[PDB]
Structure 1
Amino acid sequence: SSTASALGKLQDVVNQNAQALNTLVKQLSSNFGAISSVLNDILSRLDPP
C-alpha cells in the first residue's frame, strides 16, 4: 500500500512493449533518402516514372 516499485517485474514488460511500439510510429517520419517522408506529397508533385 505504500512502497512503489513493488511490482517492478511487471512494469518492465509494459515499458518494453510500449517503447517498441513507440519507435515503430516514429520511423514513419524518416526519409530514408527520398525528398519527403510523407507519401502523399511525392504523389502530389511527381510523375509515375
Structure 2
Amino acid sequence: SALGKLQDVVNQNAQALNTLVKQLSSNFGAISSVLNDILSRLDPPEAEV
C-alpha cells in the first residue's frame, strides 16, 4: 500500500470498464438481453419496441 495512490487509479479504471461491459447482459425490461434472439423470435412491430 505504499504505491496505493497509483494503484487506485488503475483499479478504478478497470472496475468502471468492467461494469460498463457487464451492463450489456441486462434486459432493461426486454424479453432477452441478446439482440439477435429478440429480433429473430418476434415480428418487426414488436421487435422495435
TM-score by length of 2: 0.85
Identity of aligned residues (%): 100
Q: Which runs of 5+ in 2 are unaligned?
A: none
CA RMSD of aligned residues (A): 0.7
Displacement of 1:27 after TM fit?
0.5
- Structure with bigger helix share is 2
CA distance in 2 between partners of 1:13 and 1:43 (Å): 40
Displacement of 1:43 after TM fit?
1.0
Count of paired positions: 45
Displacement of 1:31 after TM fit?
0.3
Q: Which structure 1 residue ranges, 4+ long, deviate > 6 Å from structure 2?
A: none
Structure number with larger C-alpha Rg: 1
